[PDB]
């Protein structure tokens, strides 16, 4: 039982008091523009506010308190150093004289250069938000390219692998493209025969994650690129799994023309319960002219925001992007350097490959298990539902991995430990995953038991939704 903030409030109670001499509305705003009824906001003192949210935080878990093996989210440690770094640039206004914001602009430029060097890209935008925002940006860029070369009406197809995340086709489809699904081989990699048969002058682009959603590196990526270039198809890189190869391989050298990065994933920006985040987009020279505006450039006189991009797709979000997130990513990269990022990738892969062995020993199956990278997809033995195993994990004090994805693997458990988790933690987790398979069916189907709340009525939430306190 935990009280809602609205239940904690009392009529007339005050919290923060930021105004010494409050003026009268009627003297500043004409009657007809004044709010008649006050918004029903909480009325609580500060102590209550602190009690409420501190209490809510204690009814919550994060990387700071629990192992989060969330596949395709890269739940790595978020250095506290970065939060200190972020507050150093809090008092800056986007519209202040750029001549007085050279430090911020310089930082944005340097991060730009770093991300480009790790990605093998020629230009980059640090403007797009988290989620599919950068994904949309990259697609629009590919569309602008073809349209400009005069093939916009023919390049109407985007190709995605059967294992791709629903996000990929949803974004392409939203950009007016027709999506064709390509089946993968028995190994879980791209079927080259299916792709060759499918390629042609009608295909605008091919979207891939490498390593793919199964945690497997696409070993024939150079052939796939050769094939795409031959058909004039743009190779798009979903960067969700960049963590496996930082420093070992550049997406650009694999033939990718555009790269979608996620700072809140690969570069430690905190996940913050869903956001905010940052999705920079790197591009090869032939696509740079379509990048959204503005871009951060360096002149002999100084850093500036470049808006003079005649072929730009425009603006995709406000101002210049999640600046505070950029600061964090910058701090991270300047901390580890190439050798630190390279080692992180290696150990992220070692942790996953090691945990996979532990899970297989615990009785779990791995449908596609070629050499594992930063993640892998396991399945419980027949008779168990990933759903139930997840709830039992909750009871055992661990957080489950991504469940029911990728779709090509039933009862899938997508596990990604990241490089910051310790060897003994991987083992403890494996022990828990194993002990669950020995638990009676009823105990499993009725877990958890000790968490702040037990299994929730998802049906009532859908048929009898209550979206606000005042519903």
């Amino acid at each position: 039982s935990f009280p809602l903030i609205f239940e904690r409030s009392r009529k007339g109670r005050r919290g923060l008091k930021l105004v010494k001499a409050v003026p009268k509305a009627e003297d500043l705003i004409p009657k007809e523009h004044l709010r008649e009824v006050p918004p029903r906001l909480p009325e609580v003192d500060e102590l209550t506010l602190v009690r409420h949210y501190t209490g809510l935080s204690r009814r919550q878990v994060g990387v700071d308190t629990t192992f989060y093996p969330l596949g395709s989210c890269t739940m790595k440690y978020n250095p506290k150093l970065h939060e200190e770094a972020a507050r150093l640039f809090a008092d800056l206004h986007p519209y202040q004289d750029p001549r007085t914001a050279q430090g911020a602009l310089r930082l944005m430029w340097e991060l730009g250069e770093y991300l480009k060097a790790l990605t093998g890209m020629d230009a980059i935008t640090l403007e797009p938000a988290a989620g599919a925002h950068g994904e949309l940006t990259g697609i629009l860029i590919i569309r602008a390219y073809h349209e400009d070369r005069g093939e916009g009406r023919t390049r109407r197809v985007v190709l995605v692998p059967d294992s791709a995340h629903g996000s990929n086709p949803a974004t392409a489809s939203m950009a007016g493209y027709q999506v064709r699904e390509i089946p993968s081989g028995p190994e879980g990699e791209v079927d080259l025969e299916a792709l060759k048969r499918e390629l042609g002058p009608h295909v605008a682009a091919l979207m891939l994650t490498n390593p793919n959603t199964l945690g497997l590196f696409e070993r024939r990526i150079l052939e796939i690129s050769r094939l795409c270039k031959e058909a004039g198809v743009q190779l798009y890189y979903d960067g969700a799994n960049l963590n496996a190869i930082m420093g070992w391989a550049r997406p650009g050298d694999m033939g990718f023309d555009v790269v979608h990065l996620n700072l809140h994933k690969t570069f430690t920006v905190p996940h913050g319960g869903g956001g905010p985040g940052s999705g920079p987009v790197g591009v090869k020279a032939h696509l740079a002219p379509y990048l959204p505006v503005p871009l951060v450039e360096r002149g002999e006189e100084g850093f500036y925001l470049d808006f003079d991009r005649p072929k730009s797709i425009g603006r995709v979000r406000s101002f210049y992007g999640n600046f505070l997130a950029l600061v964090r990513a910058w701090a991270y990269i300047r901390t580890l350097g190439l050798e630190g990022l390279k080692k992180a990738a290696a150990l992220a892969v070692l942790n996953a490959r090691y945990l996979k062995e532990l899970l297989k020993e615990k009785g779990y199956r791995v449908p596609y298990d070629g050499p594992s990278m930063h993640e892998f997809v396991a399945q419980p033995p027949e008779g168990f539902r990933a759903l139930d195993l997840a709830k039992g994990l909750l009871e055992l004090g661990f957080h489950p991995p991504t469940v029911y994805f990728p779709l090509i693997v039933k009862e899938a458990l997508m596990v990604e430990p990241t490089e910051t988790e310790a060897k003994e933690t991987l083992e403890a987790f494996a022990e828990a995953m194993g002990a669950l398979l020995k638990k009676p069916k009823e105990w499993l189907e009725n877990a958890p038991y000790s968490t702040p709340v037990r299994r929730l009525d998802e049906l009532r939430a859908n048929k009898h939704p209550k979206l606000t306190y005042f519903d």
């Binding site: 935990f2 809510l56 930082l107 905010p276 070692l350």
Partner: protein
């Protein structure tokens, strides 16, 4: 330096355990010709050295605390109690609450966030937040086009120029048409809406700070069978008639005004509130109250079926995530001030703005542009180039005169005031402007 815990002995056992000869061996199946390229990055640095470098870059800037710049971002007081609370590791490091039983802190706060937003807007429901105000507008508009099945959009030029740019990009993406209603005399005239129009968009307060009675706009849209989308600053909703009271179908806006640090335009979260009637088309996340197996109250992400209703036709959308952390800071802010505290902050900001307006109007050559009544921001016509003025002001230690694109008029500069500005601060700025001109 790095964050890995692996000791060399542990790395050895693990490598042996997965059948690898070394860390490099882990990548032996990748194509050799592109492995380990000579990437150029600065040499690694200890954390203290990284902070020194960060501080040196910050020292290159002139802080904008208490700045007079406006246009979507303003220097409001960032309450330390809110920042201390949003800094709690459990909120900072958690992810999307897909496992509700150990995510009740996040799920409940989000529920409280949705209700506070719907109240501020005077509407029935709201999602868990958008990336920012501009993307919120784009999404809100697409919701409308989806709901009416139309592809035409009328937007007032009074809507933030960047918002209109983000909107154009989204509309261009889904194949919709956008018509801009030019502003005359600083306000937007009532348009004649055709049946091809699925959404009419107006901002209040204006981008130039003008208040606009949205009532007639909503009528004009409903009469044509179109939906009305209101763009309103959350802080102004503390004292201004809300879009819901005007009969608006959808309401969007940016939350930076609710105590968020300016962070060079970075920190944001957009809000989107609408009627329960359009919940099928509502993009983003939705948290609903429910109950567990033993009757305990709980909260959980709900109605994911919406993903189908949103892609069934034209003007598709693909919001994958939100701005949870920043939206959380907003809710903490709204909860910290309450109905009266918010109203007070809003009024004080309007008062100092109006006083500053009268002061600057005394400088010779300076004429007003934004008409009355206006809120806590306003545009003045200057005798010199605004970009040159802003720089001259900056050189004197002041941040002011935010340049207005010339599509609104020549030599226009925006000024904004907040609850932390005082009589003495306005005079200082005016003096400076006086000497600059």
């Amino acid at each position: 330096m790095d964050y890995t815990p692996h000791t060399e002995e542990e790395i050895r056992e693990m490598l042996r355990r997965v059948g690898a000869a070394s860390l490099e061996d882990l990548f032996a199946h990748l194509p050799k010709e592109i492995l380990s390229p000579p990437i150029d990055l600065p040499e690694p640095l200890p954390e203290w050295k990284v902070l020194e470098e960060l501080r040196r870059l910050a020292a290159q800037n002139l802080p904008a605390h208490k700045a007079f710049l406006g246009g979507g971002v303003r220097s409001h007081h960032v309450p330390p109690v809110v920042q201390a609370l949003a800094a709690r590791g459990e909120f900072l490091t958690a992810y999307t609450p897909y496992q509700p039983e150990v995510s009740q802190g996040v799920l409940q706060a989000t529920f409280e966030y949705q209700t506070m937003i719907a109240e501020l807007a005077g509407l029935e429901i709201a999602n868990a937040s958008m990336y920012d105000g501009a993307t919120a507008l784009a999404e809100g508009v697409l919701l409308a086009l989806r709901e009416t099945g139309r592809m035409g959009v009328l937007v007032s030029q009074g809507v933030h120029p960047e918002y209109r740019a983000v909107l154009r990009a989204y509309l261009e993406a889904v194949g919709a048409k956008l018509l801009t209603l030019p502003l005359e005399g600083g306000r937007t005239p009532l348009p004649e809406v055709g049946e091809e129009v699925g959404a009419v968009v107006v901002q209040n307060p204006n981008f130039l700070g003008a208040l606009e009675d949205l009532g007639p706009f909503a009528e004009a849209a409903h009469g044509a069978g179109a939906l009305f989308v209101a763009v309103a600053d959350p802080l102004s909703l503390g004292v201004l008639k809300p879009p819901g009271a005007y009969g608006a179908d959808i309401a969007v806006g940016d939350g930076q005004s609710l105590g968020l640090p300016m962070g060079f335009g970075g920190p944001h979260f957009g809000f989107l509130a609408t009627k329960k009637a359009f919940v099928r088309q509502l993009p983003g996340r939705l948290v609903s109250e429910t109950v567990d197996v033993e009757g305990r109250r709980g909260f959980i992400l709900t109605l994911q079926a919406r993903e189908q209703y949103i892609r069934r036709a034209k003007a598709k959308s693909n919001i994958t995530t939100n701005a949870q952390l920043t939206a959380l800071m907003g809710a903490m802010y709204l909860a910290a001030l309450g109905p009266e505290g918010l109203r007070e902050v809003a009024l004080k900001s309007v008062e100092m703005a109006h006083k500053l307006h009268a002061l600057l109007l005394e400088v010779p050559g300076v004429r007003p542009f934004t008409p009355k009544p206006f809120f806590n921001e306003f545009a003045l016509a200057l005798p010199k180039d605004p970009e040159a003025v802003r720089r001259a002001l900056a050189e004197r230690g002041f941040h002011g005169a935010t340049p207005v694109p010339r599509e609104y008029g020549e030599n226009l500069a925006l000024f904004a005031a907040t609850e932390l500005h005082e009589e003495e601060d306005l005079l200082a700025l005016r003096e400076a402007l006086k000497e600059v001109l």
